[PDB]
Specification:
The structure is cut from a larger assembly and holds two copies of chain A. In chain A, 68% of the residues lie in helices and 1% in strands. Chain A: This is PS2. Chain A: Keywords: Membrane, Signal, Transmembrane, Transmembrane helix.
Amino acid sequence: TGTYNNTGGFNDADGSTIQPAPAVDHSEAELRDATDATGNYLAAFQSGDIEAIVGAYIDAGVDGFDPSEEAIFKAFEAARDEATQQLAFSAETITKTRESVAYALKVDQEATEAYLAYRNALRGAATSINPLIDAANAANRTDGSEIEIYDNIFLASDVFTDGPLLLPAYRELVALQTEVNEDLEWLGEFAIDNDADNYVQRYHIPAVEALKAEIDARLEAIEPLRADSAEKNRLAQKSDVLVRQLFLERATAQRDTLRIVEAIFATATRYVELYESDEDVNVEGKTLREHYFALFPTLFGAASFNVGVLNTADDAVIDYYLVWDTDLETNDEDAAYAEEKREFALLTYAKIFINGQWQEKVKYVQNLDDGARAEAARIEAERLADEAYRAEQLRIAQEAADAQKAIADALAK
Amino acid sequence: QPAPAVDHSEAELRDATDATGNYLAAFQSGDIEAIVGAYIDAGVDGFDPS
């Protein structure tokens, strides 16, 4: 049950029912295009000039302008139908934006998980390597010219920080492995034992071999985590979640404005329709057509408030499409999404107690209307039923009396 | 409700009362933002405005 007028509660034709939001990547350009496809419809309404509104949303008609009320009613009905369709599209825009936001959250969640795993692996390798380096350095008797004195790993890029860079550390580890493999081959020479001031001993080779084996065992496990971290950090940089939140806010404001636009058009259509009509009954000391005319002053303020909100909602997107303060210090952060979500939810909660003021008046007038229309059928229905019942009762009684006369004449014979 | 003489320790009273007094901290503060943040669930990551 769903129409411009309905008695079935929440409706999907307006954007009030529940809808799932799987993580599906809808590009921000798609959001911008879909939102601008509707924002062009509201330029005349947001301007506020009545002449522009009547020129844009109302059709002039045949070259010879017909001033009869029927053409005016038809034009208003067409405008109302167009507004209804625009509202139907703005409904689906919301779900599109929500799915985009969900995907944008999932990607950088996975990216930061992978980064943490890779950093932990690097920290473990750093913990494991250094003691063997010290042990091998302690067991050296050469002059230190070709077989140099080793230095502690990660001398520049401090890995123990929470969010440091991690490529220079890997390159330093690779360079250390290369240096170890280079210095290992000179241990196989024949004239390395030059003199007492520089020579080799028995325990240098086992230490060097153990260090090389540990490095080779660590790198083999380090590699896949580095690859996954790089791949996932590159992917999460191709989507921002803040602009999608802004688009969601803008589309919600657009739907809110389209609601009152449709309400105004429907009110005008119904007011024009009830001209000199049989259904224009009188209630509460006034005519039914009179009740509709009183709705405009409140709508002209509620729509003003909605347009004031939508103007800021529109201006926010244009100035913050691709610029700093929308992307932040690192690839994954929820300290900014949470605050904006909180503010948006608070604004959504607050606005549900404002539109209801005019919603209840519209519901009151509409309720008067369908109550009168539906009550002006039950008398006729019951009258027809009672007439049929009485006719059937009389017919049955008459035929029974005829049957009694029949048996009378039969057994009297 | 009846009330037979049964010894419930004052520490039990304090714990049972504080188990409820934590619920009313946001309401007793009086700030509407704290109330809506504490007693109302935000929902799915994509905030549904329906």
